[PDB]
Amino acid sequence: YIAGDQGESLANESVEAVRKIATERETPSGVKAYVTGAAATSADQRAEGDASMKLIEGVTFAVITVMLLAVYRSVITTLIVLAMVVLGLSGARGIVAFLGFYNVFGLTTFATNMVVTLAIAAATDYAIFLIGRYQEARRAGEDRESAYYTMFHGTAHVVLASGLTIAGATLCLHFTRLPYFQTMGVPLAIGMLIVVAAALTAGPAVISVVSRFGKTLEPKRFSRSPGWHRVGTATVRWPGAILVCAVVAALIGLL
Amino acid sequence: AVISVVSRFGKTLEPKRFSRSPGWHRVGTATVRWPGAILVCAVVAALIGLL
Amino acid sequence: PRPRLPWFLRTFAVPIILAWVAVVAILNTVVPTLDEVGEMRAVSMAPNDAPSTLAIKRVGQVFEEYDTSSSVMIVLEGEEP
Amino acid sequence: ATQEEIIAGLAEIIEEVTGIEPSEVTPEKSFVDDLDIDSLSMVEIAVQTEDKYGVKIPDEDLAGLRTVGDVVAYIQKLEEEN
Amino acid sequence: ATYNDMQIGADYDLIIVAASALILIFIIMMVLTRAVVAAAVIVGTVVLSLASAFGLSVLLWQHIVGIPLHWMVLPMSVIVLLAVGADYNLLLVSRMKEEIHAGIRTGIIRAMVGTGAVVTAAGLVFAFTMASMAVSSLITIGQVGTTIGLGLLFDTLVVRSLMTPSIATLLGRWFWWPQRVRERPVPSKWPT
Numbered sequence A: 001y002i003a004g005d006q007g008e009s010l011a012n013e014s015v016e017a018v019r020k021i022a023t024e025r026e027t028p029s030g031v032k033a034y035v036t037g038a039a040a041t042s043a044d045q046r047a048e049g050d051a052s053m054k055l056i057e058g059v060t061f062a063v064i065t066v067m068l069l070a071v072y073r074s075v076i077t078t079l080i081v082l083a084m085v086v087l088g089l090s091g092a093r094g095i096v097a098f099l100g101f102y103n104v105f106g107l108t109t110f111a112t113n114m115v116v117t118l119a120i121a122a123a124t125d126y127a128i129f130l131i132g133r134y135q136e137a138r139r140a141g142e143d144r145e146s147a148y149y150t151m152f153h154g155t156a157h158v159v160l161a162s163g164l165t166i167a168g169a170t171l172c173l174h175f176t177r178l179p180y181f182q183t184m185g186v187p188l189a190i191g192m193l194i195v196v197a198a199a200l201t202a203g204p205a206v207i208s209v210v211s212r213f214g215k216t217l218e219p220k221r222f223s224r225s226p227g228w229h230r231v232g233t234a235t236v237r238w239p240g241a242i243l244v245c246a247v248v249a250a251l252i253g254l255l
Numbered sequence B: 001a002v003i004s005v006v007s008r009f010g011k012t013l014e015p016k017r018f019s020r021s022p023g024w025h026r027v028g029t030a031t032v033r034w035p036g037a038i039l040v041c042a043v044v045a046a047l048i049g050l051l
Numbered sequence C: 001p002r003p004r005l006p007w008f009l010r011t012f013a014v015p016i017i018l019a020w021v022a023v024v025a026i027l028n029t030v031v032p033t034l035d036e037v038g039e040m041r042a043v044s045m046a047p048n049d050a051p052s053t054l055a056i057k058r059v060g061q062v063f064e065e066y067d068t069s070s071s072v073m074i075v076l077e078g079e080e081p
Numbered sequence D: 001a002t003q004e005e006i007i008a009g010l011a012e013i014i015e016e017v018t019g020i021e022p023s024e025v026t027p028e029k030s031f032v033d034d035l036d037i038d039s040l041s042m043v044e045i046a047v048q049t050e051d052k053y054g055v056k057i058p059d060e061d062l063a064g065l066r067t068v069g070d071v072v073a074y075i076q077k078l079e080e081e082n
Numbered sequence E: 001a002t003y004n005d006m007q008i009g010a011d012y013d014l015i016i017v018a019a020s021a022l023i024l025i026f027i028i029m030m031v032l033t034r035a036v037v038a039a040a041v042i043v044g045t046v047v048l049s050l051a052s053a054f055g056l057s058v059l060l061w062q063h064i065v066g067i068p069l070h071w072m073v074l075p076m077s078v079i080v081l082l083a084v085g086a087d088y089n090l091l092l093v094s095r096m097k098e099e100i101h102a103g104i105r106t107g108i109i110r111a112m113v114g115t116g117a118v119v120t121a122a123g124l125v126f127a128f129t130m131a132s133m134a135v136s137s138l139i140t141i142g143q144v145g146t147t148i149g150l151g152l153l154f155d156t157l158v159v160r161s162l163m164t165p166s167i168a169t170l171l172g173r174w175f176w177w178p179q180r181v182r183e184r185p186v187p188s189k190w191p192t
């Protein structure tokens, strides 16, 4: 029996201490010490997520980068989107760690890993909506000045509502008997709020400034989506047939 | 007393820059027509150090 | 007739960006990284209401051996008996 | 209304659906190869016409119509069918 | 028994989490859209996506890979799928209200073109982001990412593209109830 309970940081230290002496001893030839337990398995579970967290961060970006290149068809535009993502992640990582250092709320490996990925993905989606609407205004022929106002008018409230929805959903995770779920709602809810504030403040500020410096945020494809016009038309005149196909897809998952 | 005495003996205390202030002239314009916008920026700077 | 909020994000765009960079700079310098802080705040997965956790602790209390709920085992696996 | 006015409205609708210039669209032109317009695109034209000018063209009649003048003649017939 | 305690706790929490999440999302969508039915459709469509999403992840791991899904995976994936799914529907629905002025039928077409690959790109990236978690050595973390990632693909390509527009077409004015909206405006005369 060792100090601390399963999942607690003290147990991880206790498992480390017991295993340390077990490793640092003159075991007889053939005989080897093997420290194993439920707490030990949980203790090493925390480390794996924390250790792999660096690799998860690297892969996530690499995927987004490539995706940003294809969608916007512009290297300069891709870097602008990435810049807002880094700031969003940096704010999310800081405040969650900031409050945790003062023992405001607990943190688990599942909580920490989910805080990082969610923040990065959410931030990327918010940026696309702002820029995507902005380039849509540019294709409509609006100048760089009126496009900015139209962009913020038609996306800020939607982004605001979407962020609260994500934050609100994570808030419900707190109302759980289990500790891991209960201790994960608060970190996620706070983390999402930072991104929404950052996306609605740093986002428009960057878009306002960068557009003034040459042809940077202006689109380049200037091409429609032939598929969408066909998809929408079918739903307008024959919604039942389209709905049945949607219903069929849901039933497939039920199998 | 020092200023009065020295000023009469040669072109000593007369200004040499002889240049107006473009930085302060523009800032004063912003702080008048949009006091709320300027004040909000000022308040934000104060709250930064509280962390 | 521009709305105040987007206009404030445009006319004063430059200071707004600087503030966010300044705020982030404080957060990382003052407080250690997320991984370091997160390990300290590792909460126990065993719930308080869980009878099984209480039962193991209760055994230690009555037997006056321990008060925890986590125990490890050291196996001395040898080539020969 | 007048044949020219019906074309002007339809040609504007055709531009939105695909991008064909209103001046390019003439009653002589046909959706087969002259306009290079698929049946699905023609369906959307009827939907926009129904929600803008109130002219309802069922898909059965859409297949029957061949050229712009044919569409206008049927639409102008609907104007007659008060 | 501790695993049973985890099981019993998870069973109660999952029901509570699901009910609480749906109610909050219902109100938030109701407040912004100012339509009772429209919020219900948005919430209702998302739930259908999760049902299909759940089976795919189970097939991916329990059947294809063979490693069963972790018990904690399902409660974690529910909130994220519900949260993101409601957002993409809201983006389309909010755009529809901005386009419903010139006919319900025409407005739907404009909304799809207005928010097409834009939401699709954002939807794809989020799914990839979740899939990028799998790289984690711990399979439990990997399972959570894959389950959420698959759902976003279904929500972006099925519910948003097909299910949501179809329902609004059938309801017509009822889709925006209690707000009064005309099915179509006054028919116009042919311009010169």
Ligand SMILES: CC(C)(COP(=O)(O)O)[C@@H](O)C(=O)NCCC(=O)NCCS
Pocket (backbone or CB within 6 Å): A230, A231, A233, A234, D038, D039, D040, D041
């Ligand atoms: C429009 C139609 C039903 C009939 O077309 P036809 O009369 O030219 O054969 C079919 O060809 C069609 O849909 N063509 C467009 C391709 C597409 O993607 N349609 C999507 C709507 S389901």
